Design a binder for this molecule. Structure first.
Ligand SMILES: O=c1ccn([C@@H]2O[C@H](CO)[C@@H](O)[C@H]2O)c(=S)[nH]1
Ligand SMILES: O=c1ccn([C@@H]2O[C@H](CO)[C@@H](O)[C@H]2O)c(=S)[nH]1
Ligand SMILES: [Mg+2]
Ligand SMILES: [Mg+2]
Lengths: 480, 480
């Protein structure tokens, strides 16, 4: 079975791998030597060297993350519905988005995050070869070549590098069945091409985050109250709370999302070439091998989150159109959506059979879940209160709607702080100076839950100094 | 009956008058020599020299405007309700407004509109004595003295100068029963004192125009959609459409509004003195005499509109509290208000007996009116669509809510343009250059009513040049 040859984690091997070994470190440190202890979240599992527990290798942990990508896809929504949905979404974006100028090579390079890695093949921090206005040395070569390919409309095969997310998790994912989330890291070449191709559209969409349902680019504090006020114009509210959103995606769906992006781009012919590269079967470097991934979402590119939100919008509209039999453009007259990758809040005036809705979703291969369990139809409520979005609870009072971080999460940020990578999470940062500057984003947030809880959080102690009690509340809710 | 002596237009004469003779001119010119003709609004009546019609003197016209001020007041709302309402409104503002720094003399002077008159006693355009950072000559003296009085917390008697509003009106107010609206022009001294005293509060309130119901300072384009989205969170919508709001006000009500402003000011002791001057019986210079006006709203001061909106809020809450029996702070949990002087939109979840509501209002001496007539309870609707605010119709679609100028009004601005004062409205501006610069605020606005009407308005002709057809629509609705 000559190349692609053999098999890794159920998937075809296309080549030898060049990725660096998976990180054994976390960026999180304890803020105090006192113990947590009980049920407290901690940084995700760090592998064989993880003093906290004996467990499998990070590569084993990663293989587990790769399983869903070889699961069979769910079904396409009915073709007539899918087409009608895409047309409606496309028409809505046509009416809302300000046509943009093409992005230059310069604009694309500047847009990139200089603190993250360049991925294949040099795997170096982008800032290393960055003069401030251009890439130099190795990265300069990789970037210029890609840009030349982009301008000639020539295809390039993206190469993603796999990683595991360093993040706080519930202890069970450490001390029980070990789990750590899969990350896809794009290559500099692809970042350049995707940014030139799609930066214009993504900018246009972002200027539009209040009027359109794709909320990528919103400030929870500043925009949340308006977005939520809009959702509240409608009778019914729900959140499908998806499991494994990315790995359950159909390239067939991603390609329709991609078609909309291409057609709404200022260089659609150049953009088309890039998008075809992005959605073609994916080369994923897992260290030993580069394996072929045909299905699911390939992430880590600039406009991934928008692409992913777009697919979500398509699927969500498909299910509602399937179930209610209402035209997608009419569904959008009678509803307000919020999408951020797999994150969603759906509000609507329509009478939606939640059994048929939950089943339509499942049929597409998605995994919606009840806040509790037993599937078992999704919930539908008549108030917005208590629904969540971007990790905040949506709250409403006489002044308006807002997003509020729960106390658990606020408490959590008190126990942990970011700093350089190290091996033992329980170590405290030794020169425990200042959570900036800012990070009194808690207090107000903490705040928000009332004077009683706010007071106890005012043990923002260090070590200058006060107060700032305690109509920080006024400042957070209304501001400036 | 020694001073105050005799009587003018039903009101006591306190002194001889110093006001300049009422204007005989309009600032409006026709945009074309073609006739209007039928039913077309025109500039209000210009008096004896008005070639269009033979009519009474402007002073007679003004006397008619003064009648309502000697009408008996309506009744105070029940004292327990009034107190509870004031407390609730005060508490709401306490929770929302950012405490402010006191305004300096400099800040107060700069805030004044330099293009309008200084009123009593010099009656000159403010810009005449304005170096750019200070008042000089006569105005400098008047301003410094007032500021000294303000700082010593000493009282001064305001002197208002009466005028008649130059504005487009329906022809019946010209060719039928002649009518022209009364204006009160404050004196520079009082403007200084009111601005130092109340500029801080008014700034604070204005920063708050989306979260609080007093909408003074809103941009219809930018803020309208959010304000309206909020109103739309509620089941029922209404507009009391008041006749003669200002002249029907009770000083007793204005004084409670004033108390809130004083208490929320950074120099409440100094502010109190000013507010007592502002609400004490009013000296109104009508030319021949200064007459005493005890009742109704005395306008023309800086923060009049906020004071007036505040009273409106008090009265509106009183009526709803009287009728529903719900606590005012609870009424505000279940409702969204918009007030701008006499202009209002009231939205609420509560079940309001519209007969009892209309009667409560009338009892306070207000004159609510049905969009048609026959009083006859006010209307209550279950959609926002079709309600008006700041002269715009509130419109909703799949993208959101917005304010839209009606076609009549758009047509109107095509027939007339502003320019220097002249005697014959039908004259066209002879060097018919450019409606700026801008004023393509029509087109988009005109727009908004669809391509069909938008096309016909594109006779924006002059005389360079195009187009700008015709997703100006996109630009007006979403912008920037
Ligand atoms: O709230 C979020 C934020 C990001 N992502 C997606 O998760 C992947 C990165 O972890 C990318 O595909 C993102 O679009 C999701 S699914 N939900
Ligand atoms: O929409 C408006 C705008 C202004 N005013 C008031 O009208 C007077 C000036 O004509 C002042 O008392 C203003 O507060 C009113 S009543 N409604
Ligand atoms: Mg959600
Ligand atoms: Mg109104």
């Amino acid at each position: 079975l000559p190349r692609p040859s053999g098999t890794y984690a159920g998937l075809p091997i296309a080549d030898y791998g060049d990725a660096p070994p998976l990180s054994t470190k976390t960026m999180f440190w304890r803020t105090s030597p006192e113990k947590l202890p009980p049920g407290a979240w901690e940084p995700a599992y760090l592998g064989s060297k993880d003093e906290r527990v004996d467990g499998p290798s990070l590569q084993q942990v990663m293989r587990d993350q790769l399983k869903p990508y070889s699961e069979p896809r769910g079904l396409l929504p009915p073709q007539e519905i899918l087409d009608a949905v895409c047309d409606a979404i496309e028409n809505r974006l046509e009416n809302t988005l300000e046509p943009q100028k093409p992005w230059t090579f310069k604009k694309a390079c500047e847009s990139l995050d200089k603190n993250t890695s360049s991925g294949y093949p040099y795997h170096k921090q982008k800032s290393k070869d960055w003069t401030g206005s251009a890439f130099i040395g190795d990265l300069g070569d990789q970037a210029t070549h890609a840009n030349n390919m982009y301008e000639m409309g020539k295809s390039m095969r993206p190469i993603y590098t796999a990683a595991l997310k360093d993040e706080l998790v519930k202890p069970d994912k450490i001390y029980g069945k070990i789990k750590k989330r899969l990350l896809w890291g794009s290559d500099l070449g692809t970042m350049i091409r995707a940014a030139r191709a799609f930066g214009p559209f993504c900018d246009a969409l972002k200027e539009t985050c209040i009027f359109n349902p794709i909320r990528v680019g919103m400030s929870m504090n500043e925009d949340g109250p308006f977005i939520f006020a809009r959702h509240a114009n409608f009778r019914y509210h729900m959140d499908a709370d998806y499991t494994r959103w990315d790995s359950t995606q159909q390239r067939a769906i991603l390609k329709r999302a991609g078609d909309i992006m291409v057609r709404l781009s200022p260089e659609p012919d150049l953009a088309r070439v890039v998008m075809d590269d992005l959605l073609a079967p994916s080369l994923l470097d897992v260290g030993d091998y580069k394996i072929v991934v045909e299905e699911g979402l390939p992430s880590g590119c600039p406009c991934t989150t928008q692409l992913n939100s777009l697919a979500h919008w398509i699927l969500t509209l498909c299910a509602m159109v399937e179930v209610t039999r209402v035209d997608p453009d009419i569904v959008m007259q009678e509803s307000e959506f919020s999408f951020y990758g797999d994150d969603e809040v759906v509000s609507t005036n329509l009478e939606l059979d939640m059994v048929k809705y939950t089943m339509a979703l499942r049929r597409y291969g998605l995994l919606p879940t009840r806040a509790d369990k037993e599937e078992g139809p999704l919930e539908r409520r008549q108030t917005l209160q208590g629904i969540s979005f971007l990790r905040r609870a949506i709250v409403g009072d006489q002044f308006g709607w807002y997003g509020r971080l729960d106390r658990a999460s606020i408490d959590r940020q008190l126990l942990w702080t970011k700093g350089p990578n190290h091996q033992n999470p329980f170590e405290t940062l030794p020169g425990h100076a200042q959570r900036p500057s800012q990070l009194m984003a808690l207090l107000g947030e903490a705040a928000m839950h009332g004077e009683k809880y706010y007071r106890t959080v005012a043990s923002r102690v260090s070590k200058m100094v006060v107060p700032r009690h305690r109509s920080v509340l006024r400042w957070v809710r209304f501001g400036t």
